[PDB]
């Protein structure tokens, strides 16, 4: 059923113009001004921007971190993201050793199946390279568009992998045509620090941060790079936090190495102090890598501005401060890591970035949608507003001033890391593939509408 | 008179899709598929790409380098560029000390007046900062869209300016909203080297290169940067040649400094040896900075690939090998510097870059058009294929294999620096503002059709 | 019994003068010219240099690497070094997990006890940091002058330690006042490479080198540094081989970090090719890190010249090519790592370094004796020729040209890695604490004369 | 007349031991303990260190900076340095264009002739490279031991030289065997800044500093280096002040380039604030490069600690705050640059450096004496305490606590830049070539005793 979004200001990763969009088969049929066609529902976007739906490449929805599981599942999370201006997510499908990869992949397909309000895809976790694994990978690429393999350098005895596993993954990746993602923190050192902290009675939420200094993020990020170099493949460092890390990634890209960096709003806006703010409130901000000192934020922004860092992810991993977060009272190491971010990701960048001088209206769209779609083989189906691309759009209001509050967010968590934060700009209507998911700040989608996405081989 | 370019594959700096373009007021009216409108001339672009016309920010047309002047004037040069897929050029309007800036600006306007086949703009040369100059600059910005002021760090006693001049220019620029361009070569050292070379009988074309080692390009590029930092303004290093230079620019951009780098095909494809190839043929390749050792080419390409360098210019400055180039027989320093490049710029990057694995079809468009339009305030009038933008298009054939030959080029020079070079891809139809300038590899424009362009203040 | 070494040219790490040395209580009593004292044995050193005995901080004598043990034990090895101009060695006392440190320390004291011809000390290996270990360390410092604790980043499942162990060692070290030494190679990656090499039939000696690329040495050296920085202690990288490694150490020292680098002759003179030279001869050159490509040698020398690297060790670990080396025929990983170097260390540096333009006669003395004595708390007892210091001297002939041959060396190995090598300069008389150990190229010492050395706390 | 300094603790750049020195022909005859010889004056040094007299390579004594001349001439200055523990100075012999070099050299010889209390040498200033200059240089080396040529990159229209002059000097130097010294500050930029400062009424002493930002010192230092590289010669950057400069010099030495850095106490202890401290007092601290922000001091010390910087000079250039300094009341640019430092140089480094943890008792001697003697061809005549070397000694008391005060200093200036500064350690007896110049903190020398020094060709 044809639609026409008129009088809006279109803003792609490159262009900024005024025109109307004629949506047809759930795709953009044509762009121009004063469009008309009997029967079109004609949506009015006056005084609004029309962005390509956002893409969150860093999602953890039905993921289990402890005896508990994320408060937000694939259903709530999808809706949240939908309100936040995000219309496509790529969640991390976790893997267990010895167990066949297609096992996990189906487990995840079930988690998402019929509950997604918007489209999604997966990243495959890798904790070991077995002959059995090597045999599946190629299949995992063709059947199941999983073209991005992930690796934890931290989280000893839980996700961590030795450099040998990382290295062979990089090769396999280069060979098969996949992008290696990496959680760059020196697990082995963080481990001793963690143990000693506890051994000395330091259990408060803040020791979560002090127990893992930025030096260890930088160090890890470096190895990932050096190895990626040796292997001659491609790297994508997730959630770049400290300056040290930004630096390593900068050097890499200078050498022509195919390395990419990503960050998350929480690291751009919040900081280490929030972990001290008080009683047990700290736990609300416990996630890895830990929030750093306020000063790193600049470095991140500049990196974003000049290109050292090129994508923004949420690292969405919700846990009620109530039941969940409290699991680690007299033990910080027992606080489930993760924050409720999938919803305010886009907004915050526009507000803190665009609206304040950092980033450009175009850089914005690139950092939150396009660049990502490209790196993860979703372009041009996703990531842009052009004839042929899916009608994943966001009718955004750039002037509405508001305050982020858990009293308003649509995530199933009992709190919001950006509570009380004033923000300029807000999504008004968000549609995925020609169909509204959120019209006039009101939900109108249906769980199951979202469909899985097989992704390009890191090629066209 | 309405037109429709159908069945082409549209390729912007971001998008790559299939659709038709409905050209209206010399601008792009609308994009979509199966477009129709009685009376439209309907152009067929099957099996072709449709790029935003190229923009050459580095042009020297009616410029005089010696007792002689460039073989190509604004008329021939414009046509050449037109055939080469370039529809907008920004020539360097030279300045004389003590003489009022508006004097030169009009001299240039005359050189271009009624001879341009495509649109153009100017860069204002600066050899000194006088109170009189400071008074004109602001006017030079508002009246006359000249928002890019240029400086030579080399060419002692001819264009060169001390760091004080460079520094105050950077300030003035930051203040007024202009981009400072720089020819980064250590003129004072190159000078002694030059003199000594001659004093020892080394007069062949090759000593033009040996007389100015890449160390001096890097050194100069560094000062420009360090000073740009101190001043807190914006830099744009023209024709980056050696690795050393690329490096300095890389460091700058890492520090968040607002520095930009540009290169030219000749430095990407040719190399120092050509200056030895033989008799006097060397002089055909004499230009500054000099061609370096083959190995720097990689560095350049990687810089282009990863973003250290972001724009491609021609540095067009033609001289017949016959009369002109020969002016410096027993004296290389008397060979007029400059090469016939304005025509094959775009093609070479597509062929050597895109077609061979370096750059992307999108990076290509960015490096040759978009990125440039943006940095020099011509976006979105120029630099892209979108509703509202000027209909500056290029219907390109990506498969036609051919050989660059002066026997075929459309420049008024008796030779071509890329003679015999095999190239893949070629412009078939090039239109500026809805009107064909070159249809089916045949010229159909009219000198004077091209119009001057007032450019943005380094802002929207 | 008083002695007088006259007519020699004294060369310390700083001075170069002509005088006589009056040796008294096994120490240098006084320096001056035309010395006399009834009853003094008066040794004549005309046309000779008098260097402070060399100090080899990298020794593995009675060490066991496999079902076998080093061909040279503390007795032969001591004599060898004695002939080589080395009068003090610091061997690496290996440690086993769970087993008390003082156990090993005594095991070693036994290996050396009554067999040493010259003085010696120990380095304590660390494979784990236990509460039990933390309790002994302080004692290990006071009782037993062991002030240098060593860590293997490679040799997985044999010596290797995680970064946590390395990090806590660095702290303990900073706290206790010890120097952390490190074998910087990424064991986990070398491991997979090793396994795969075999899995593909690559078993020749050369795969020992290819199985462990310099990238992995640099990578490892980097971590060691970064961690040393975090901990704020002191590092000493043993056997720096590749450029990558030299670079990391250079960066560290630039940052003011207290990092030190050491190299060995074999890496300064031999290279990767020797591992291909032929049949099974390759095995003669198998040791870790592996010999690199000829070009790294320069980097090493420059590092040595300018100070990036400051000490020369042998990494003495002999194995008869016959029985021992052959243990790894169809399996390179089974070739015992180590080379017969303790004897030609000093000579080679003088010849290849001093005599050829690299290093200085003074730098020489510093790199082979003084600098080492200082870093390992043996100064000024050892490492110099000055009133009060032990009479550890070497009467060297700087002109004697000769050829290193196993047919002449005094090591118990059936071969010599520098066989056929022409060398200028040779030790004529070597005395430890006033007593000759080697007079006129003839052995005159007695096993047991050498005494253990308790070393300074990395202090005065 | 034979002398014996007994019971002292000898401290060279390498050694630290207890012995007696038998001084003979004004040189050190022999070292040992319990020395005796009828008729020797036997000096007692119990509880004292005995250092090799200090060497100040950065002196400006009878130099004229304006219509005025340094308050301290070669006589007073010599005595001052003598009290300060310095026994050898190398003053900068200034040069005028067009005027023959030997003219200036004799002018200087006159300034020093019969007024020096200790030994001295000269540096030859170079403001231009003429054929006439090229002819003298070689003579200037053989006749007149002037083997160090100096160049100002700042002080436009007064001492400044273009890069061409600097470059050819570097070559000449490499060729002839001289060391090029450089005052690294970007004169052309400092110039505009200076002019503008005045044009805006900023005339206070502090604008002397703000008028020349550290970016300009680093920039300049970089060129000197890059050029020194191109030329392949040797550089020696005088008075390294900011971090930026230290960095450039660090990079240089990393590349193996033969570059050296020097600093001065005032930059190690004082800082920018002193220029604001108040009324006109600021002028007391006006010298170039200007004092920087307190934080650079660390960088300097670390550079000194790790070796990025290797020598300490005074940059002595006294001017009575009264008449002289006041010449620039309403104009800072008219304040004669230079500070009264030749006397407390050594002491301050011992106190602030040695006594406080930075530097070593040995590093101390190296940084203030030895390293310098070596770089400027005075070793081993000067710079060490060894048989054969001149008896230039300093009997130092390491515990005497005191306060530096113009009320006590022996310089002819009406003030002291370190007034009120508490310092530990003080010279008790200073003798040059076996003769006391200062015995028991009391002057006993005679102007004229000091003799000129022809220096080595940057060789043995
Ligand atoms: Zn993570
Ligand atoms: Zn995550
Ligand atoms: Zn140019
Ligand atoms: Zn040009
Ligand atoms: Zn080892
Ligand atoms: Zn070893
Ligand atoms: Zn100076
Ligand atoms: Zn000076």
From Swiss-Prot, chains A, B, C, D:
The EC number(s) given in the record are: 3.5.2.-
The entry's substrate-binding residues are 155, 288, 337
**Listed NCBIfam families:** D-hydantoinase
Protein name as annotated: D-hydantoinase
Required cofactors, per record? Zn(2+); Ni(2+); Co(2+); Mn(2+)
Q: What modifications does the entry list under PTM / processing?
A: Carboxylation allows a single lysine to coordinate two zinc ions.
| Binding-site residues for Zn(2+) 2, renumbered to this chain | 150, 183, 239
Q: Which family does it belong to?
A: Belongs to the metallo-dependent hydrolases superfamily. Hydantoinase/dihydropyrimidinase family.
Q: What does this protein do?
A: Catalyzes the stereospecific hydrolysis of the cyclic amide bond of D-hydantoin. Has no activity on dihydropyrimidines.
Provide this UniProt record's keywords sorted from A to Z.
Answer: Hydrolase, Metal-binding, Zinc
Temperature effects? The optimal activity is at pH 8.8 for manganese-containing form and pH 8.5 for cobalt-containing form. The oligomer is thermostable and retains full initial activity at 40-60 degrees Celsius.
Provide the binding site for Zn(2+) 1: 58, 60, 150, 315
Q: Which residues carry this modification: N6-carboxylysine?
A: 150
**Taxonomic lineage per UniProt?**
Bacteria, Bacillati, Bacillota, Bacilli, Bacillales
Q: How is the cofactor bound?
A: Binds 2 Zn(2+) ions per subunit. Can also use Ni(2+), Co(2+) or Mn(2+).
| Activity regulation (record text) | Completely inhibited by p-chloromercuribenzoate and partially inhibited by metal chelating agents.
InterPro entries found in the cross-reference section: Amidohydro-rel (IPR006680), Hydantoinase/dihydroPyrase (IPR011778), Metal-dep_hydrolase_composite (IPR011059), Metal_Hydrolase (IPR032466), Metallo-dep_Hydrolases_sf (IPR050378)
């Amino acid at each position: 059923m044809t639609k026409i979004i008129k009088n809006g200001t279109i803003v792609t990763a490159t262009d900024t113009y005024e025109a109307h969009l004629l949506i047809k088969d759930g795709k953009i049929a044509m762009i121009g001004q004063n469009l008309e066609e009997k029967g079109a529902e004609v949506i009015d976007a006056k005084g609004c921007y029309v962005f390509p739906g956002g893409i969150d490449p860093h999602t953890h929805l039905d993921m289990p971190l402890g005896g508990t599981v994320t408060k937000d599942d694939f259903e709530s999370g999808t809706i949240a993201a939908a309100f936040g201006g995000t219309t496509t997510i790529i969640d991390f499908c976790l893997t267990n050793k010895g167990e066949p990869l297609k096992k996990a992949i189906e487990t995840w397909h079930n988690k998402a199946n019929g509950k997604a309000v918007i489209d999604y895809g997966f990243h495959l976790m890798i904790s070991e390279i077995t002959d059995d694994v090597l045999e599946e990978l190629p299949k995992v690429l063709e059947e199941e568009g999983i073209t991005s393999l992930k690796v934890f350098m931290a989280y000893k005895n839980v996700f961590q992998a030795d450099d040998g596993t990382l290295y062979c993954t990089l090769l396999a990746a280069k060979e098969l045509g996949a992008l290696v993602m990496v959680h760059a923190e020196n697990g082995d050192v963080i481990d001793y620090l963690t143990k000693k902290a506890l051994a000395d009675g330091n259990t408060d939420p803040i020791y979560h941060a002090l127990t893992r200094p930025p030096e260890l993020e930088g160090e890890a990020t470096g190895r990932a790079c050096q190895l990626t170099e040796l292997a001659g493949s491609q790297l994508y460092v997730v959630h770049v936090t400290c300056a040290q890390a930004v630096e390593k990634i900068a050097e890499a890209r200078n050498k022509g190495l195919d390395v990419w960096g990503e960050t998350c709003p929480q690291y751009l806006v919040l900081d280490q102090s929030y972990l001290e703010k008080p009683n047990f409130e700290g736990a609300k901000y416990v996630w890895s890598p830990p929030l750093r000192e306020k000063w790193h934020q600049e470095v991140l922004w500049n990196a974003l501005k000049n290109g050292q860092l090129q994508t923004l992810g949420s690292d969405q991993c919700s846990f009620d401060f109530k039941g969940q977060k409290e699991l680690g009272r007299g033990d910080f190491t027992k606080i489930p890591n993760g924050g409720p971010i999938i919803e305010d990701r886009v907004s915050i960048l526009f507000s803190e970035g665009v609206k304040k001088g950092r980033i450009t209206l175009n850089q914005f769209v690139d950092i939150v949608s396009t660049r990502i779609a490209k790196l993860f083989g979703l372009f041009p189906k996703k990531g842009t507003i052009v004839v042929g691309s899916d009608a994943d759009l966001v009718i955004f209001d750039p002037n509405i001033e508001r305050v982020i509050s858990a009293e308003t967010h649509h995530m199933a968590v009992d709190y919001n890391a950006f509570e009380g934060m004033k923000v300029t700009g807000e999504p008004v209507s968000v549609l995925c593939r020609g169909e509204f998911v959120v019209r006039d700040k009101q939900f109108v989608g249906k769980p199951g509408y979202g469909q899985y996405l097989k992704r390009a081989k890191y090629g066209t």
